Design a protein around this ligand. Structure first.
Ligand SMILES: [Mg+2]
Ligand SMILES: [Mg+2]
Ligand SMILES: [Mg+2]
Ligand SMILES: [Mg+2]
Ligand SMILES: [Mg+2]
Ligand SMILES: [Mg+2]
Ligand SMILES: [Mg+2]
Lengths: 156, 165, 267
RNA sequence: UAGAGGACAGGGCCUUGACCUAUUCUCAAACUCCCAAUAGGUAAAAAGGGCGAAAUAACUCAAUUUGU
RNA sequence: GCAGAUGUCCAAAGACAAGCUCAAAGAGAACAGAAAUCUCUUGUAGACUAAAAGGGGAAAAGCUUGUUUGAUUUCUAUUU
RNA sequence: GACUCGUUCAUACUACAGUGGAUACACCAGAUCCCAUCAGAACUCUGAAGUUAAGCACUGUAAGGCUUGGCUAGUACUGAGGUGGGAGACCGCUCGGGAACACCAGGUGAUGAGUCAG
């Protein structure tokens, strides 16, 4: 008969990596989380309480509830013609502050000063990022002694 | 200097091989000789030929330290008149021997008790052995600090005027 | 004899943490003692650290930060030489006094020593801290519980039960605790050791006789020092190194040490 | 799969197979120190972001400012 | 299709705390030898953890002790 | 010159060796009292005669391991196209991406908060 249990097909996903077994560090318990933060779900198999389901491993969502040792997360999931929002309740060891958002924050903080100066001197500056593009012409100086001639090789 | 060699303990062992009254008599013999309540050994495995059953009391033993140890050792080496084979010394710095009848040590015969024989073992070591047994920051003893097999013989010769076959 | 410490044995080995490898930190008691409610954010959960070296005793207040925790107060036992207590700096009484000193000093830094008087001579909501006992085991009469008492007698609030004080396995008598706080057990030992083994009495308590502290005036010196500690707890306000530390060689140097070794071997 | 080098049985100081130490030919859907190409997920600003003051609370905090 | 398992079992094999460290090997000790009890040295788990197989676990989730009945009454947000 | 509480969790581990003792960390001297055992070994409590022997700190070894770079190598594999080659099994071309063992060489740590002593 078919066997669709809760932890089926988790042999390699839910196992500790090489020479890295053991429970979490003490600094894991000092992380700061607020409502609306972005977060990553990474299952840690050395703690069997608050274990997320197979599918939600490696996904990203937003916080909507905080408790003594648990966190509620809003995660998207695609069901056959639409995307449904799921509310996942996991324990605090399987939660990681998301890093997908840091370029936006650094960009805002950095561009603020540039705008402040530009308006200070009454200027028209562009702050949108720039796609990589074609290159201008240059004059490249090379002595004739440093050029080496190559030709296809015979077969051995 | 202070790397002299002393006696860490002395372990006394008598394996009767059976439960019942004989083991308690042997325990009384140990109590009389050593003035300590002993404890009993339990068989790990099952062997039909020796008739041993799991968790069954088979033997009784005791361990002593200090002034009492150096004189029970003296009685034992007196019974053997200070004669030990070279094979008796392990490659780590210990030794021991045996006795066939417990009467020779000075215990009056008893029509109920019968004959009992025991083993002696010493476990020589130097001072600073506490670091390997303390709970807090237990560590290892360096190699030069250990006692070799030759030293267990030199110590015997000097201390007891013993004779090595 | 097959070898166990093989090359493949070393390749697969996973090492423990440094302070577990050194026998210092528990790491299961630490995290339970530090973690607070995730929805109770911006609350720090101070903890009262007590360590007892060989010939001393230490107390602190820590705060468990992310890059290394922070010490808010400190008190060592040898400071009691200044408050009028000579040798005997491992006692139950020494522990009590060191626990008192840390509390009084900590309150002074925050200008709160006038709103929290503690208790007078031994017979708002206070600041709370939790007791970290390190690696020792907790029997009855363990010296760490004297420090807890000396700090609760100050202005602090350390949550605790009553069955681990001396002689209190199943019933709490305060008089026998008070005896150990004033070092009366030491006094009676000096008494009883004097009658028999009169020379062993002189060998055991050498540094007491030298300082003129007799078995009839022990309690009064601890009583005086308690008042003195309450009166003023503020803190009081390169080396030659005749022996030298060698350095590390480099790849270039190590090659000629082998050249010369082989050259010497050749002859 | 095969030799090499070392310290339990074998008639009376050597078969052989042992045991150990460095090598050697060949393998795995239900083996793994390592590990692609393709295929996935979140983010890229005004019902918002930043900064400074106040007002409400039965929550939180040693804190009628601690914080939220 | 492939190699297998389920219709049970447990007042402890459930709860909490403390102390401790396992398989195996070598060398030693009266009867005692391949296998009985005891001492030491090495030991990253080669043991154990009710039952298939996979994952987890070393001042422990294993061993031994002490105290117990959170295997209790009621409701919500939810995952497969 | 030393200490307590931490971070990184082997450049930090393992084996064998050399050096060190103002204060300090230890080994150490004991068992009346709290407490603990078959056993004051361990645990707990009270001390201050002796010592760097050991723990610990710092170094060494054509050391094992670990760690970074070069190379292996545009090799092995692979996304898109083909009225491409070949009986087949398999293999080139156009537009793209790109390893792993082994071997060689260099290294063997760095750091937060507080405190003591001359
Ligand atoms: Mg899974
Ligand atoms: Mg604990
Ligand atoms: Mg192959
Ligand atoms: Mg495992
Ligand atoms: Mg435990
Ligand atoms: Mg030395
Ligand atoms: Mg090397």
């Amino acid at each position: 008969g078919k066997s669709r249990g809760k932890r089926s097909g988790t042999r390699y996903k839910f196992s500790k990596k090489f020479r890295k077994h053991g429970e979490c560090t003490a600094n894991k318990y000092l992380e700061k989380l607020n409502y609306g933060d972005y977060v990553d779900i990474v299952c840690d198999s050395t703690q069997q309480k608050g274990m997320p389901f197979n599918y939600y491993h490696g996904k990203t969502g937003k916080i909507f509830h905080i408790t003594k040792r648990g966190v509620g997360v809003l995660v998207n999931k695609r069901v056959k013609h639409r995307i449904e929002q799921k509310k996942v309740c996991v324990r605090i060891e399987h939660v990681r502050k998301s890093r997908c958002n840091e370029d936006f924050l650094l960009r805002k903080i950095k561009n603020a000063e540039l705008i402040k100066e530009a308006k200070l001197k009454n200027e028209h500056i562009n702050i949108k990022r720039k796609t990589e593009g074609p290159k201008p012409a240059a004059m490249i100086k090379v002595p004739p002694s440093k050029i080496i001639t190559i030709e296809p090789l015979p077969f051995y | 200097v202070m790397r002299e060699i002393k006696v860490n303990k002395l372990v006394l062992n008598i394996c009767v091989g059976e439960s019942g009254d004989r083991l308690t008599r042997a325990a009384r013999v140990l109590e009389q000789l050593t003035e300590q309540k002993p404890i009993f050994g339990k068989c790990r495995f099952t062997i039909r030929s020796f008739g041993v059953r799991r968790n069954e009391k088979i033997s009784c033993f005791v361990t002593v330290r200090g002034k009492k140890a150096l004189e029970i050792l003296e009685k034992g080496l007196k019974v053997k008149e200070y004669e030990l084979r070279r094979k008796n010394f392990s490659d780590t710095g210990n030794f021991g021997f045996g006795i066939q009848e417990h009467i020779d040590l000075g215990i009056k015969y008893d029509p109920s008790t019968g004959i009992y024989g025991m083993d002696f073992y010493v476990h020589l070591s130097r001072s600073g052995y506490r670091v390997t047994r303390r709970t807090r920051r237990r560590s290892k003893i360096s190699k030069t600090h250990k006692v070799t097999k030759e030293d267990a013989m030199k110590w015997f010769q000097t201390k007891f005027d013993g004779i090595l076959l | 004899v097959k070898v166990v410490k093989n090359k493949a044995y070393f390749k697969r080995y996973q090492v423990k943490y440094r302070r577990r490898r050194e026998g210092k930190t528990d790491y299961r008691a630490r995290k339970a003692l530090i973690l607070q409610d995730k929805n109770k954010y911006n609350a720090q959960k101070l903890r009262f650290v007590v360590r007892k070296t060989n010939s001393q005793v230490i107390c602190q207040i820590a705060c468990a930060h992310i890059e290394g925790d922070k010490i808010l107060a400190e008190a060592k036992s040898k400071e009691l030489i200044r408050y009028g207590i000579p040798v005997g700096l491992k006692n139950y009484a020494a522990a009590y006094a060191t626990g008192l000193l840390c509390a009084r000093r900590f309150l002074k830094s925050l200008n709160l020593d006038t709103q929290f008087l503690g208790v007078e001579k031994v017979t708002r909501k206070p600041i709370k801290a939790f007791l970290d006992v390190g690696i020792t085991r907790t029997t009855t009469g363990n010296r760490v519980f004297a420090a807890l008492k000396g700090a609760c007698d100050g202005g602090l609030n350390i949550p605790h039960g009553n069955n681990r004080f001396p002689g209190s396995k199943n019933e709490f008598n305060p008089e026998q605790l008070r005896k150990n706080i004033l070092g009366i057990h030491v006094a009676e030992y000096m008494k009883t050791l004097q009658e028999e083994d009169n020379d062993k009495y002189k060998t055991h308590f050498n540094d007491y006789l030298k300082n003129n502290i007799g078995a009839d005036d022990i309690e009064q010196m601890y009583l005086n020092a308690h008042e003195k500690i309450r009166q003023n707890p503020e803190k009081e306000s390169k080396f030659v190194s005749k022996h030298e530390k060698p350095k590390k060689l480099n790849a270039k140097l190590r090659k000629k040490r082998v050249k010369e070794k082989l050259a010497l071997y050749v002859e």
